Amino acid sequence: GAMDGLTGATKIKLESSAKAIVDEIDAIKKKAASMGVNFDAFKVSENPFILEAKVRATTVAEKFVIAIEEEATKLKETGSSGEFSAMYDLMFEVSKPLQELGIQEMTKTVSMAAEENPPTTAQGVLEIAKKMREKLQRVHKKNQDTL
Ligand code: NI
8 A cells, every 4th residue: 555566658668677687787797608708896897798797787887877867757647656666676786697797786786876966856766876876987997988
């Protein structure tokens, strides 16, 4: 009676965009495996493939975060707590495979952002999305520039 999530076009748009990240990262992982590449961060990269991988992953992920920003903005006036919490859940969930590509601190970027500005409102979602997107962009640039 207060915990129901996304519906309609917003649900399809955001869940589809999130799934695209997971699909892309799964495919990157498979390519890596075929070439014997390990994304283990402890082992600015020197490896061309890892550079491309991070650009690819952060591109698809940023499209998702933009989708979050668009829908949170749309839902500012009439969106429910359950909808905003669901948007946070998608951001946090896709941060996990991103971190596994060696994007250090990705899940913490998201959860820490929610500590300052929790997803109880559109404003909160937008602040978390901004921090997530900024992090993606920083990673994107460093690796693209090197390339
Ligand atoms: Ni409910």
